[PDB]
Design a protein around this ligand. Structure first.
Ligand SMILES: [K+]
Ligand SMILES: [K+]
Ligand SMILES: [K+]
Ligand SMILES: [K+]
Ligand SMILES: [K+]
Ligand SMILES: [K+]
Ligand SMILES: [Mg+2]
Ligand SMILES: [Mg+2]
Ligand SMILES: [Mg+2]
Ligand SMILES: [Mg+2]
Ligand SMILES: [Mg+2]
Ligand SMILES: [Mg+2]
Ligand SMILES: [Mg+2]
Ligand SMILES: [Mg+2]
Ligand SMILES: [Mg+2]
Ligand SMILES: [Mg+2]
Ligand SMILES: [Mg+2]
Ligand SMILES: [Mg+2]
Ligand SMILES: [Mg+2]
Ligand SMILES: [Mg+2]
Ligand SMILES: [Mg+2]
Ligand SMILES: [Mg+2]
Ligand SMILES: [Mg+2]
Ligand SMILES: [Mg+2]
Ligand SMILES: [Mg+2]
Ligand SMILES: [Mg+2]
Ligand SMILES: [Mg+2]
Ligand SMILES: [Mg+2]
Ligand SMILES: [Mg+2]
Ligand SMILES: [Mg+2]
Ligand SMILES: [Mg+2]
Ligand SMILES: [Zn+2]
Lengths: 131, 184, 52
RNA sequence: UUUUUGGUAAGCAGAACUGGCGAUGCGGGAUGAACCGGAAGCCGGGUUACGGUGCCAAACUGCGCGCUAACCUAGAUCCCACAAAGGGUGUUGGUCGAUUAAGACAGCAGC
RNA sequence: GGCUUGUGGCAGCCAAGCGUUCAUAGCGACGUUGCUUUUUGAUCCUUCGAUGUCGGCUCUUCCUAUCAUUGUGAAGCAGAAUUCACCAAGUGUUGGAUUGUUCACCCACCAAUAGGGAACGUGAGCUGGGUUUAGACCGUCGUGAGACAGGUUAGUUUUACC
């Protein structure tokens, strides 16, 4: 099995990423990252596969003005694979889930990082291409 | 209030070779030889003939308290080389059986499955002490030796190695406990 | 399940005790004074409570 | 110091009698205007006051009895630089009462 | 800063009662003994030929009256969680909205988001939002000049080479 190795963190708090699911939300505004113990003055940051707390700044009214967990599926900041290759996506994206990691939506638009798929089997089930 | 003279005496058996010099007592018997250093006692040891006499002169009540302690220790040495000491322990468990593995010529024991834990508890017997699993009784250990302190201390090491933690010990009574303090 | 004889032996070490009301030290059942120096060898002792 | 008012109290404020400091060094209190001793020309000798005599540091590890053992930094000298109620089967003295060779107490034994 | 500790904060003793039963697992009424100088007062001993006067930022060190972490005792401790107490200051104690704030409050993360000292640490280290010069406005007060531990806006932060 094993746990996921560290990745470059490219999405600090206040980062606004695209919503890659069909829940009706168009973007996700990151307000915190789970598992961050932190450092003075250091902004919490997330990478692909990290669960974050976010708010929908643009989307269906039923999803706005609310705090919900989400999972990052793509990021623009390059990160190093163990085989020495640096990867990155064209944009930053995430999907809304519940505290147990179950997707709120039912479909995912675009590819998702392999790191996120391994940690979240529910997200991988609804994914199209896992890279 | 210092009493002028406090003295106590004990009888030395016929088949014991007791040697005393400068509060260094050596006892030899059929089972072996035992020696204890009593230089920390401010007493006067004397063999009169066989009997052992211990005197305290102008000693406070605390000082005279060591007179009986010295005799009891000497008596234990005599019994150690004549009859020996046998401490029996019993495994106590509710659900998980306690598995014991004797090894190294009965000079070591390993406890496994204590409350289902995967950690292996290893205890090494002290000098002159041998541990053997009893066959007549179910889940019983037998520790034998000449020195009561070493045999009794070996049993204590086993008992304290199997303490339950983070639980109500009143209900979780699992452990290894001394059931009999006797002699061979 | 534990045999009645064995559980009586176990409770000799874990249940039959006196507890100091000042320092909570475990004392032998016939104790009259606590052996601890922090409480001043207090004589205020209580039995160790049983399971109901 | 003592008497003494206001104030929870204050190295706070205000009075009474005397002394002291201020105006004054000197010996002691490690150090200190007021505490203890004592007041002074420049010197030699002798003896003391308070305070001291293991080293710092002049003078005993002097001659005697007991108490204390501090695994809390035991304790160590007027003013003075702190400690309380309440506790200890720590140890040492004392006071009152009860029991005991007709056999107590502990344990052991079947009252 | 110093004396003091009323007030503020922290702790103990007695045991009426609470705790289904049960004074003392956990609590402690009526009383009573203390500690602390991270509160505010009291005083006016030092400084008025001047010790730069709020807070934040930055940075180090120290305390323990321990929030989390290591080892344990107790429980009205089955388990899980929680509570009381002991040794313990080695390591850590965060990201944000509003406010000049200290304080506070909420959102979120976290093993935990404990409490304090160092001239209420720290302005020839910064910053200058506030307070606390001169301009100006309002309200109330005053016949008026003007006043306001009321509100408002603009207002030079010097020097090290000893
Ligand atoms: K955090
Ligand atoms: K006494
Ligand atoms: K006070
Ligand atoms: K001044
Ligand atoms: K400076
Ligand atoms: K301007
Ligand atoms: Mg910051
Ligand atoms: Mg539990
Ligand atoms: Mg005055
Ligand atoms: Mg004058
Ligand atoms: Mg002095
Ligand atoms: Mg002379
Ligand atoms: Mg001497
Ligand atoms: Mg007293
Ligand atoms: Mg009260
Ligand atoms: Mg000046
Ligand atoms: Mg100046
Ligand atoms: Mg200066
Ligand atoms: Mg402490
Ligand atoms: Mg329960
Ligand atoms: Mg610390
Ligand atoms: Mg703001
Ligand atoms: Mg202060
Ligand atoms: Mg300051
Ligand atoms: Mg400065
Ligand atoms: Mg400046
Ligand atoms: Mg400043
Ligand atoms: Mg300004
Ligand atoms: Mg102005
Ligand atoms: Mg008018
Ligand atoms: Mg202004
Ligand atoms: Zn105690």
């Amino acid at each position: 099995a094993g746990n996921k190795f560290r990745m470059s963190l490219g999405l600090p708090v206040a980062a606004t990423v695209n919503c890659a699911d069909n829940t009706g939300a168009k973007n996700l505004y990151i307000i915190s990252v789970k598992g961050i113990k932190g450092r003075l003055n250091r902004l919490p940051s997330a990478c692909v596969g990290d669960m974050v707390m976010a708010t929908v700044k643009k989307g269906k009214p039923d999803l706005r003005k609310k705090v919900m967990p989400a999972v990052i599926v793509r990021q623009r900041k390059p990160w190093r694979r163990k085989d020495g290759v640096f990867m990155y996506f064209e944009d930053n994206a995430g999907v809304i889930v519940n505290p147990k990691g179950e997707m709120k939506g039912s479909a995912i638009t675009g590819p998702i990082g392999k790191e996120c798929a391994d940690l979240w089997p529910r997200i991988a089930s609804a994914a199209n291409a896992i890279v | 209030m210092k009493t002028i003279l406090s003295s106590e005496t004990m009888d030395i058996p016929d088949g014991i070779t007791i040697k005393v010099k400068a509060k260094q007592i050596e006892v030899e018997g059929p089972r072996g030889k035992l020696t204890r250093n009593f230089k920390h006692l401010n007493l006067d040891f004397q063999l009169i003939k066989k009997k052992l006499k211990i005197d305290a002169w102008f000693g406070s009540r605390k000082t005279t308290a060591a007179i009986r302690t010295a005799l009891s220790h000497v008596e234990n040495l005599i019994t150690g080389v004549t009859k020996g000491y046998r401490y029996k322990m019993r495994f106590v468990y509710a659900h998980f059986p306690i598995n014991a593995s004797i090894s190294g010529g009965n000079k070591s024991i390993e406890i496994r499955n204590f409350l289902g834990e995967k950690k292996v508890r290893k205890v090494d017997m002290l000098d002159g002490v041998t541990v053997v699993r009893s066959e007549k009784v179910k889940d019983e250990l037998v520790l034998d030796g000449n020195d009561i302190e070493l045999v009794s201390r070996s049993a204590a090491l086993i008992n304290q190695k199997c303490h339950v933690k983070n639980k109500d010990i009143r209900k979780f009574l699992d452990g290894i406990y001394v059931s009999e303090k006797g002699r061979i | 399940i534990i045999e009645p004889s064995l559980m009586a032996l176990a409770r000799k070490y874990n249940q039959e005790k006196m507890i100091c009301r000042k320092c909570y030290a475990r004392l032998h059942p016939r104790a009259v004074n606590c052996r601890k120096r922090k409480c001043g060898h207090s004589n205020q002792l209580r039995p160790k409570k049983k399971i109901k």
